[PDB]
Ligand binder design. Structure first.
Ligand code: Y01
Ligand code: Y01
Ligand code: Y01
Ligand code: Y01
Ligand code: Y01
Ligand code: Y01
Ligand code: Y01
Ligand code: Y01
Ligand code: Y01
Ligand code: Y01
Ligand code: Y01
Ligand code: Y01
Ligand code: Y01
Ligand code: Y01
Ligand code: Y01
Ligand code: Y01
Ligand code: Y01
Ligand code: Y01
Lengths: 591, 591
């Protein structure tokens, strides 16, 4: 069960490790593994040369062979680099080469997560805040690369190093030395495991007390006026010092525990070194070992102990790493609510009709739904989606864009149901003029060019001229290519509105879901917007949604939505003659 | 100049180090210094014993003396603990004892800063946000203790260790070995210094690029609706890919530089080890040194090199530490704007009069001042401080509490000018009822007992009964001692208002600067507040400030402030007969 899941997690890590496409990175990782094996050989070979040097000195060896032996050992030591600190040539070269591989896998996972996040639905994005999602994403990617590197380069190589050391001592020394080192490692790890949990128990409550102390301090200083009112400066410093005293007590518990842990580890190392040194001294006394074996044991056992010092640090790090990785996988586990059907054919859009019929959209987490809405819009016409201020208006536009899935009913464009056609093909033929146009942190060229990435500067200039903003574009200080955005030059409502008009001009849509922004910047500017809007909406189909009544006058068909169902339909004079909510609401808003 | 300032800073650190009062901590630090000297002796004594062991093995020494020599060396090694990692008994004991000393100094500096912060003026507190001040304070305290420990225990001891090593090699070996180690340390430090600045230059721009990449990513995801509008998922992942690629390039520059730094240090160590090993091998070949000297040099030179590995880490840490300390000292450099005069005598308050006369308060960072305000309030009277909504009303109350210093004029209470009397004595006889009462995170007992810390539960209950809140206190779920605050049970406007009434009841003031909260919770509750207000204000002098006109009816003297000067003074009927702004504003607010 859980072991099978762990195996799948390991399989996924293995799949992330190997570069599938690049042929050079496969050679890089193969070279890296070779360097790892070589570094293992260096660690076991250095003490043998140190023994050889000492055995040559203890006898009267000539300077000729001694010189080459000493130089060879130092070169061998230079490659190894000793224990922790001052890493050797092989380890540094292996770390230098692994940079490209870890960058490649980090980039691949980052793009996979980002593409998936954009592939989800609108409802999920409204439900969740994006900041924590980005935090989960980056933590997951860092966790994956860090966990992969640590497991392959730090844990397994050293476990092999300890096994090799035990095998060497048991074979080429008396088997007692193999027993001594085995018992030392068993005791060393067992004691570190059983003490670290005790230490972290003390560590946990320290943070909570630290957070509690400063909260009282900042609350004392924030209400400065009341403190001065009642003369409680001495009283509040006394309370602060008492909270400090408690925090100091927790600090002492944690620090004392850490000192005990270090002393226990040092003691275990000392006892193991004592047992080996005395046994080796006895055997060399009785003409069974040589003088070089004493120093070989002394150097090698310390070489074996040094890596184990960081066992606690990775133990408390690997747990956080794994939960972050699981959190990332949980993030990728989500699926799109609104899915494309297996058919997902293109769109047979020739001229473009619109037909709603008995659309009973059950809107989640909201009290505003739509019940029995049904109307048709022929090509080259209008339909004003005016009515009381409710969520049912914009729900129609977002439901026609397939932002939200149908609940009950059918949507027909040119006689084709929109559910079977793919998402992009349907969505490409729809142009929207949002309530508040959004500009990114870039120039004017690539903000107007966002409606179609493949467009030259002449084309975007013609589009700006057609919209009617080119004069302001030229009048801008930096020229046609000024910096406009949240980090750059600010623009007015009409400026961004005509940007969106230019965007939808070069989008070349078939049906426009025009929404009135009704920002009411200037009446003359509003008329200019209307003139440009008639220019961009000429000879096409629009579903104008207006919060005012000016554009409702010219609509061929005019609809009033009674909080989910259409109540009045026809023409403005006909609806004024009907004298429902239309008549008095028009009288109120006209004066 | 700057060196003199550095010397003063060192003197201040020295003053912070030594516990002035506690007699036990002086013994603790003296023991700690002794342990430091002992640890230096251990570091120089261990290799001598290792040489002794090897020289005994190389000859046919009996097992009797060899056993004690080996055990003595291992015990000596256990005390030392070797190099970095697995610290010895002496170092752990020294760290264990230093906890109390660093806690004591950290607590003392923390309380000094907090007391100073409360000792400043209101204007400074309004000007600056408190959160960053707390951050500066805690960073300064941690910087002081961290820098003190590092300088006394890590830099100086090792500088002594290197000097001792050079002296030993020059004296008890040939002086060539002293030259070799001196050249190695000079080259090692010089190369680390000249490479670290180059490395951090590469490191600086990496952070800026990292911040720039994620900003584009999060801006892409925040505007999800527009991305889906224009079909730019592929376009945006491409932009994210390119930004990632640039960040990877900066990462590679930084990582490559670090690898070069490590390789350079390792190579310098190797060359120094090569020179010493070959020279020592030659001398032991020519019957000038013994076989134990070869291992003595090998162990000692590595013992000397190991500490220098962290030179970069403290170099990049000490700079941040010092600037944080300077920032803290800058914070403590500020002085109070409103100071007590050297006289600062008590107050001869017997019955209590109030006299303003030609007070031309020039209010900073504000357009509302007060020009020629002059009125007198006899004991047991009223004075309604009503008028148009301006900052000149509350400025009178805060100017009488001496939050702000006088600018031009005199303030007399019972014929005594308040400037000469001390701050606390004047401020103790004034009771204020603020606009919005503030409650801390504590119980009912110590919230109403905040008006006077020395009070029993019977007294606070009687005060609550007099105010009129005891019934609600009993009705609370937890009883008389419920948890009320921002983290506890919430209370209404009338609840906290009667809390403040109880506070000022047990404050026992002489003159009350009553300010009407006019929260308008309930009309009956407002009448109850008025009845309690008359109960607490009976037979004392009040300067009632009302944003409404109900309490202005009963005032003996009624004032209207014309945005800095009093325009109308007298009684409500007399002012209604004058028929200025009083008459029409009363008619407007009465209906
Ligand atoms: C250090 C020297 C003096 C002795 C050891 C020689 C070789 C063991 C090493 C040193 C540098 C290595 C090269 C450094 C960089 C690369 C680039 C590497 O390709 C990539 O990084 C491609 C990246 C991508 O496709 O995105 C392929 C291996 C290669 C040629 C390496 C092959 C193995 C080399 C020659
Ligand atoms: C898969 C990864 C973890 C790499 C593992 C490599 C080891 C299985 C091998 C590779 C080369 C071996 C070394 C090659 C040569 C020698 C010399 C050998 O010399 C002797 O004392 C025995 C020979 C003799 O009797 O003269 C001692 C073992 C040692 C260091 C070997 C130890 C085991 C090593 C490191
Ligand atoms: C890492 C880079 C900077 C290169 C470092 C150079 C060393 C590898 C060289 C420089 C001096 C050389 C040494 C100079 C002299 C000798 C004596 C030589 O003795 C002989 O057999 C020849 C002399 C004689 O006949 O007595 C043996 C090699 C050795 C130790 C040499 C070994 C190689 C050394 C250490
Ligand atoms: C995985 C790690 C912890 C290594 C553990 C492997 C053990 C099963 C080995 C290593 C040491 C071995 C022992 C080391 C040496 C000897 C001495 C040998 O007997 C003699 O040499 C007798 C000498 C005499 O009588 O003077 C009998 C096996 C024994 C106990 C060995 C039995 C098997 C042991 C315990
Ligand atoms: C001389 C050589 C053989 C080493 C002996 C050193 C001992 C003095 C140390 C080593 C391990 C220590 C123990 C390691 C862990 C614990 C558990 C600790 O309590 C818990 O962690 C219990 C928490 C729980 O699991 O509920 C109390 C101290 C104690 C017994 C320690 C007491 C002191 C011990 C025995
Ligand atoms: C010089 C070398 C040998 C280090 C010696 C240091 C000791 C004097 C310190 C290290 C850890 C300390 C202990 C750390 C924590 C505790 C638990 C503390 O009690 C609890 O917190 C109980 C918790 C529970 O009941 O679960 C009482 C003190 C004690 C035993 C401390 C006593 C003093 C100890 C043994
Ligand atoms: C907790 C860690 C540090 C392990 C501690 C284990 C030691 C206490 C044990 C392991 C092997 C033991 C040794 C194994 C074999 C011998 C040889 C034995 O004498 C012989 O067999 C002589 C052989 C001959 O003369 O040929 C005397 C005891 C002694 C030293 C033993 C004494 C106790 C030792 C060192
Ligand atoms: C770190 C803790 C676990 C203590 C480690 C203690 C060992 C290092 C001691 C205990 C047993 C000792 C051995 C016990 C017996 C002998 C046999 C003894 O030989 C004799 O002269 C008596 C026997 C005979 O007559 O042959 C020489 C010392 C020696 C090897 C001792 C060497 C040192 C040993 C291994
Ligand atoms: C059988 C069970 C109990 C697991 C045992 C696994 C250990 C053998 C592993 C886990 C953590 C490892 C250590 C984790 C971290 C380090 C530091 C690492 O080097 C660095 O990252 C240096 C960082 C620095 O210098 O600040 C080299 C491997 C090493 C010594 C590792 C050595 C092997 C250890 C002890
Ligand atoms: C570790 C042992 C087996 C050998 C070494 C003995 C002494 C060098 C050390 C060990 C513990 C030390 C004691 C540990 C704790 C204290 C408390 C200390 O007082 C305080 O911490 C007072 C704090 C305050 O007043 O706020 C005075 C020194 C003293 C007695 C120390 C004196 C020196 C002692 C006895
Ligand atoms: C103020 C702080 C930095 C402590 C500094 C202490 C050192 C000045 C002293 C204290 C004890 C000294 C040690 C005491 C005894 C010896 C034995 C001495 O033995 C010899 O080889 C010379 C004697 C002889 O000729 O037999 C070598 C120096 C050494 C380690 C001394 C080195 C210098 C030490 C560490
Ligand atoms: C850290 C705590 C857990 C205490 C550790 C105990 C050690 C300090 C003891 C246990 C065994 C002792 C050894 C046992 C036997 C001997 C042989 C002994 O030789 C003799 O002169 C007596 C035997 C004979 O007559 O042959 C010399 C001391 C020595 C190494 C002893 C030194 C002190 C040792 C290592
Ligand atoms: C602060 C650190 C870097 C130590 C620097 C101190 C130097 C001024 C000392 C240390 C080594 C000394 C040198 C080491 C040995 C000798 C050999 C000595 O002459 C001989 O022994 C001649 C032998 C022969 O002719 O065979 C003359 C002094 C000299 C050059 C010494 C001069 C003074 C030196 C450079
Ligand atoms: C064989 C032994 C003697 C060691 C020689 C190793 C060299 C290959 C290393 C050691 C120091 C290195 C240098 C250390 C620092 C710099 C400065 C660095 O550029 C800067 O930092 C300049 C910035 C500025 O100050 O404006 C360019 C590389 C360089 C010359 C390095 C080139 C490679 C060097 C010479
Ligand atoms: C295997 C051991 C010997 C390490 C060898 C690693 C080298 C291949 C790396 C380490 C640092 C790298 C250098 C780090 C930074 C730079 C600066 C870079 O140019 C700049 O950024 C210029 C900056 C300026 O003009 O100020 C060009 C590549 C270069 C020389 C790199 C070239 C490759 C180097 C020398
Ligand atoms: C960059 C760092 C690693 C320093 C490198 C310095 C070495 C290259 C120098 C320092 C001292 C020099 C040595 C100083 C003295 C001697 C002894 C000299 O011969 C004698 O004086 C013999 C004396 C006698 O026979 O009594 C031959 C050269 C040699 C080895 C010198 C060779 C070059 C050495 C090792
Ligand atoms: C790490 C870098 C700086 C290179 C380090 C090189 C040294 C370790 C070499 C270079 C000079 C060498 C010395 C040069 C001269 C001599 C004299 C030579 O004696 C002879 O037989 C020739 C002279 C005579 O006839 O007396 C023996 C080797 C020795 C000590 C050499 C020992 C090794 C030394 C110190
Ligand atoms: C003459 C000028 C160029 C200044 C030279 C000062 C150095 C000799 C100092 C500065 C930083 C020091 C190091 C900074 C940090 C450490 C780690 C410190 O131990 C720890 O804090 C361990 C932390 C861990 O294990 O994570 C012990 C001292 C040491 C080696 C210091 C040794 C002495 C150093 C190299």
């Amino acid at each position: 069960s859980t072991w099978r899941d762990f195996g799948r997690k390991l399989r996924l890590l293995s799949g992330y490790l190997w570069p599938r496409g690049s042929p050079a990175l496969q050679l890089v990782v193969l070279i890296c593994l070779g360097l790892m094996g070589l570094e293992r050989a260096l660690n076991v070979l250095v003490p043998i040369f140190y023994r050889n040097i000492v055995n040559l000195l203890t006898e009267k060896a000539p300077w000729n062979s001694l010189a080459w032996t000493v130089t060879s050992y130092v070169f061998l030591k230079f490659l190894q680099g000793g224990g922790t600190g001052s890493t050797g040539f092989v380890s540094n070269l292996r770390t230098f080469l692994w940079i490209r591989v870890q960058q490649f896998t980090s980039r691949r996972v980052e793009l996979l997560i980002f593409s998936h996040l954009h592939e989800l639905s609108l409802r999920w994005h409204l439900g969740r805040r994006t900041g924590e999602v980005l935090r989960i994403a980056d933590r997951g990617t860092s966790s994956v690369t860090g966990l992969l590197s640590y497991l392959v380069f730090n844990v397994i190589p050293t476990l092999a190093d300890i096994i090799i050391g035990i095998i060497y001592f048991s074979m080429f020394f008396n088997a007692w030395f193999g027993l001594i080192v085995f018992l030392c490692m068993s005791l060393y790890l067992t004691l570190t495991i059983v003490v670290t949990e005790w230490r972290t128990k003390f560590r946990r409550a320290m943070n909570t007390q630290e957070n509690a102390t400063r909260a009282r301090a900042v609350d004392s200083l924030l209400n400065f006026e009341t403190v001065k009112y009642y003369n409680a400066e001495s009283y509040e410093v006394e309370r602060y010092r008492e909270a400090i005293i408690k925090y100091q007590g927790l600090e002492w518990k944690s620090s004392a525990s850490l000192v005990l842990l270090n002393q226990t580890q040092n003691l275990v190392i000392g006892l193991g070194l004592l047992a080996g040194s005395l046994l080796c001294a006895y055997f060399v006394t009785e003409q069974k070992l040589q003088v070089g074996d004493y120093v070989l044991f002394g150097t090698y056992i310390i070489q074996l102990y040094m890596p184990l010092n960081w066992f606690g640090t990775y133990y408390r790090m690997i747990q956080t790493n794994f939960i972050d990785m699981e959190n990332m996988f949980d993030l990728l586990k989500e699926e799109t609510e609104v899915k494309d059907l297996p058919g997902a054919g293109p769109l047979r859009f020739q001229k473009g009709r619109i037909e709603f019929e008995n659309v009973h959209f059950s809107y989640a987490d909201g009290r505003e739904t739509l019940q029995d809405v049904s109307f048709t819009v022929m090509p080259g016409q209008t339909l004003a989606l005016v009515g009381p201020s409710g969520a049912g208006k914009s729900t129609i536009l977002r439901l026609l864009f397939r932002f939200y899935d149908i609940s009950s009913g059918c949507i027909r464009i040119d006689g084709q149901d929109i559910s079977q056609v793919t998402q992009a093909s349907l969505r490409s033929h729809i142009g929207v003029v949002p309530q508040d146009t959004v500009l990114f942190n870039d120039t004017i060229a690539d903000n107007i060019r966002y409606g179609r990435v493949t467009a030259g500067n002449d084309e975007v200039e013609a589009a700006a001229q057609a919209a009617g903003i080119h004069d302001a574009i030229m009048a801008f200080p930096e020229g046609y290519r000024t910096q406009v955005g949240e980090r750059g030059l600010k623009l007015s409502g009409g400026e961004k509105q005509r940007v969106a008009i230019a965007r939808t001009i070069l989008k070349a849509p078939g049906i426009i879901l025009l929404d009135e922004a009704t920002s009411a910047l200037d009446t003359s500017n509003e008329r200019a917007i209307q003139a440009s809007l008639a220019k961009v909406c000429a000879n096409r189909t629009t579903i104008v949604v207006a919060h005012r009544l000016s554009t409702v006058v010219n609509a061929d068909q005019i609809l009033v939505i009674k909080d989910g169902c259409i109540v009045e339909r026809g023409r403005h004079e006909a609806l004024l003659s009907r004298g429902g909510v239309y008549a008095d609401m028009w009288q109120l808003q006209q004066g």
